[PDB]
Amino acid sequence: PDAMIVIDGHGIIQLFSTAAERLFGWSELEAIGQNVNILMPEPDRSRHDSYISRYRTTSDPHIIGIGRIVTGKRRDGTTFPMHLSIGEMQSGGEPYFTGFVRDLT
Ligand code: HEM
Ligand SMILES: [Cl-]
Ligand SMILES: [Cl-]
Ligand code: NA
Ligand code: NA
């Protein structure tokens, strides 16, 4: 029953499920088009794009297919513990990443 989020190869949100709206505080329309780093606190925020670049040029996963409990940040600035699972998919020869987010609250 997790929240689902999809981003492109550059970290830009492409889909934001209903549950993601309730969890993070942004509407689907607002989230789409924004970098996924708006959902996290520092230092991950400023480093997330590097996380993605690192994976695309090495193909060495740290969270994909592994999973981790991390800290997410709501629209009102408050942080919470969440479990994160990530998958990779191709469409039109382009990479997209699918994320499942479980609020551990
Ligand atoms: C909401 C808070 C999130 C946090 C705190 C977060 C945190 C992180 C961290 C810590 C890493 C690097 C881990 C390491 O190098 O050991 C990472 C990697 C990654 N993140 Fe995020 N992330 C979040 C959400 C997402 C979402 C929703 C997606 C996908 C839709 C996403 C996609 C990725 C990708 C593609 C990687 C690189 C693959 C890998 O390293 O295995 N992240 N993230
Ligand atoms: Cl997992
Ligand atoms: Cl885990
Ligand atoms: Na938007
Ligand atoms: Na894990």
Swiss-Prot record:
Residues 1-56 form the PAS domain. Residues 57-105 form the PAC domain. Heme binds at residue 48. Transmembrane segments: none annotated. Putative oxygen sensor; modulates the activity of FixJ, a transcriptional activator of nitrogen fixation fixK gene. FixL probably acts as a kinase that phosphorylates FixJ. This is Sensor protein FixL. It comes from Bradyrhizobium diazoefficiens (strain JCM 10833 / BCRC 13528 / IAM 13628 / NBRC 14792 / USDA 110). The chain holds residues 153 to 257 of 505 of the full protein.
